[PDB]
Symmetry: D3
Subunit: 160 residues, 6 copies
């Protein structure tokens, strides 16, 4: 086993994928934002705050998926065919945990794990930006790959 | 207490900071990447792999700090005065944990918490991109604010 | 009277504003999207379509204000202090007309008319993108400046 | 009929077009800029002002077509195969009206209506930026789709 | 003497300029494009080719000045106050040489040498892009700083 | 022979390549940075300065290849399949000359000469940015195309 993102001189390169074949590739990444009770309360009630934080974070996440190659040095620029995000409130203890799941799809010679991970990361950062006025102690993550299909390494799926 | 990023119609807005005063503001954010033993071994030895993953991730993180306003919908575009990142290998158990700490500085009417958090997040994503060929099970985070100075809310510092 | 955006050789330049003074500047721009009855009905009822088109368009508009200098060749890159957008349904006849009003604020040596106009334009384009599946005949505009304050030319205000 | 840009949770998503087939797609959009007599005179005579406003606006429009996915939240990033813009002075009354027509072409599973509309919009905004020193009362639009070919909805063509 | 763009760990950082004072800074950079006789002939006659290559290259150069921080890893994002470019045909022998001179101005705690150099470089690349259909043998450069004012290192001026 | 980047009205357009066929295309560009003895000494010894300038410049160059269409007005946005850069110190006299060679690969209907040239140019500019603290007299270039394969004009190769 060995790195693929370094060249003959030990420096970063964008791996040549010219020969590889084009297949349907999908990647699912997950992260979360743990928040204070106050933040959870204001995000789940429209009694006073009618603003939708998730709608904004969703948009940021989708747009981030498209900006992945602009942010990750060696990532290839791809023609994403689809990007969607799903939210779910959970309770990792007594604290409220917003779980974020990003799914990215494409047709090409390279996976979209980075696009999914980046979409999830920026989605979380946006939730943080929209709620930080209430509390700066919010915690993002862990962030990880849930699964990916297509490509050489076949189907990947985090064990649970 | 209340959200600041929503307008009179319950939709997202970039808060007007015209009246606020310009002061020295700093923000420190932290995250990490937990990796397999193989990834740790190849990143800490130059015997075969001479490529520097941290050098690439560092560059990505600094550039991400500058792209923060392009990624986070309601963030103000700022003239960052400084951005630096520090790395440290730790052992959150028997697994190797790369700790990433991003520090951002500026002079203005709004904090740089998002710039620091974004810098740290993309730095981590880049480490993941550079090592994923070896293992897709890497875990990023938790990501959180360590401290921030300047501004209304005074000095913030996560308790440890 | 004469152009300011052309140089000694008759080609485009970014006008030097080094000597000018920094003052509070605001700009308000307006546009609209005329839509079919079906589009209006689905955007104003949550009975089936619960998606908020305006929330997405609002985010796009704010982000576009920040990208103004990236899109308009000779515009100066500014540290926007605030950006907000307001919506209102009107009836320019028997057809439904969504009126969009973008307000941009800053502190500097140049106005933000372009930022407001661009914010409004992209906000409208986003409404169009979100509803085009229903009808491609939507009409955007007219788009124009409502008013601007600060600067040499003093206070401007479109007569009505 | 129903929206396609919203997901199972009522939030924005980039529609999956993985299954669709790749065909030749074209889109033509139109807009205009109504200007004062003075602006028209200086743009149509090289006696004193030799700067070419249309050359600058043309460049901005083409570049905007490529930035469409960066500006419109749910638009797919495409490999545009061609982008061209045409100008024509008209007289919508006694006032001078610069008509702008943008044509975008590509080969893929999704239309380029947004790319054409965005190209036209930014082209107009650039004309406004280059002439605003003379008058801020310029009016942009209406902006609309003239026609599009390829895709499910077959050939579209605005009736005149 | 020592590098300023590396941190305590030997990796890239954006130097903190928080303490420095804000002064008027200017930078002038120069480059050129050596072309074949055919390219020179078509660029200097409107008999058949009426397209203005310099107008396009000028726009690209100005826009590149603004994108400098997006391209150069450790450059600070600045509020440029002015950007202009000048062209001149010369004869570095019997071959035609288009000389490009970019001038950038700002008010801040850091010079704009990179903005001027980048503006000149992209301006040249654009001339190349517009004429490559005629010949791929065009040569760009040398590219260098002509002079800079303001800052610690005082006034710099290349000896001739 | 004639320009391809101008339309029927003598203004810039992105040439339609819809009909052309997709083939493997490669482009190799070269440039250099001539530096003072002091700069060469600090870049080739780790005795004190352990920072790797080439690692940073390499990353900037690869990322610039992907940003080519954002910088060069009429360039088509492509799905680059590979980007690599190679360095070599030479002595164009008694002065030290860092030679930079960028290779870009893709599969499509248009060459990647601009991507290679842009990658090389920004790589050089980054070396300059990282070393300018030591000397502002560094000279970049000449920059030129070494060779390109695929496409109509067949195989191109600069004579030496």
């Amino acid at each position: 086993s060995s790195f693929t993102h370094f060249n003959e001189q030990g420096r970063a390169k964008m791996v040549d994928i010219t020969h590889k074949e084009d297949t349907v590739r999908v990647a699912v990444a997950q992260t979360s934002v743990t928040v204070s009770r106050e933040i959870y309360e204001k995000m789940t009630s429209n009694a006073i705050e009618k603003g939708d934080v998730l709608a904004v974070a969703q948009v940021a996440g989708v747009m981030a998926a498209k900006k992945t190659a602009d942010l990750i040095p060696m990532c290839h620029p791809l023609m994403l065919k689809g990007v969607d995000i799903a939210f779910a409130w959970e309770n990792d203890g007594e604290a409220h945990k917003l779980v974020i799941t990003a799914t990215v799809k494409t047709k090409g010679s390279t996976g979209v794990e980075m696009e999914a991970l980046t979409a999830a990361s920026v989605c979380a950062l946006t939730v943080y930006d929209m709620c930080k006025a209430l509390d700066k102690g919010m915690v993002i993550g862990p962030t990880y790959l849930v699964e990916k299909t297509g490509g050489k390494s076949g189907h990947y799926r985090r064990k649970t």
